[model samples]
Target: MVLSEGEWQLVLHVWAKVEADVAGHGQDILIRLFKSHPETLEKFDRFKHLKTEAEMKASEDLKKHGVTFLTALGAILKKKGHHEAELKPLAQSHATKHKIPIKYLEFISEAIIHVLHSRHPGNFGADAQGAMNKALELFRKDIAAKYKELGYQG
Candidate 1:
């Protein structure tokens, strides 16, 4: 099912919160995500390098690449004169690559939103639902650009 613009935005809002969670509480969140979605662990293991320092280093490198892609996206948005797009497809692609359905995406978004409300009540409020929608558009643009950089056609 095609998500409405509002729903798309909600996805972004919650995803940003999730990223914050990962940065601040990486292992805990990662463990929780893995446990909750054992299939995700398979993807993680498939794409991950958990053996040696070099393997860890490679993961770090990929993360760095992701950062660079984000920065590039911001620059592109600035250059293009579109002030509201952020590039969320980076997260979406993972879901898409894993063949996660729209419903699963919605479930993931709701779960992350609940986590955000619980963990950082100070940073969110009733207006978050709207903010999430705006965030989604911005992030999706960013993701589309990043995907192109990574040689993805979609």
Candidate 2:
């Protein structure tokens, strides 16, 4: 909603590619996040020991987590981040219980952008990349609000 219809629609257009391979894309995102910021692995106890790509890709735990992450992304994109009812619990859970740092969310977004650009190549242009950044920032802002509301600042 904050983004113009043209920009948001560009995100959806690219989202379809991820929708087609959620598991693969999700796996790549988590891997990218952890690989880029090994320190963030502390939050995911189950995956902290995942030292090898082959092991990570084969782990059911990773697959499930990836699916959950992608599905959340799907929900956010479905409504374009306007559904407080849907997103509030996300903010609450991560902020209160999970205690995930917003920094890791930024890491994930970077991985997502890397994957989007690599997978779609030509489908991702300046405008499409711009839309994705805006959308993710909006997503991050909404989640940050929840973190603040829950009194979790990190």
* Residue-by-residue lDDT tens digits, candidate 2, 1-154: 3998888899999998789999889999888887788888789878888888788888998998999989988888879757688888898888878788888889888989998998997778989999999999998888888788889993
Least accurate 10 contiguous residues by lDDT in model 1: 77-86
Clash totals, every prediction: 11, 0
Taking all chains together, the TM-score of candidate 1 against the true structure is 0.39
| Per-model lDDT | 0.46, 0.86
Q: What is the lDDT of candidate 2?
A: 0.86
Residues 20-136, candidate 1, lDDT per residue (tens digit)?
534333333333444455454455544354544345334654445445534443343333334324334444455457544333334444444455576767556666654553443
Could you tell me every candidate's TM-score relative to the true structure?
0.39, 0.95
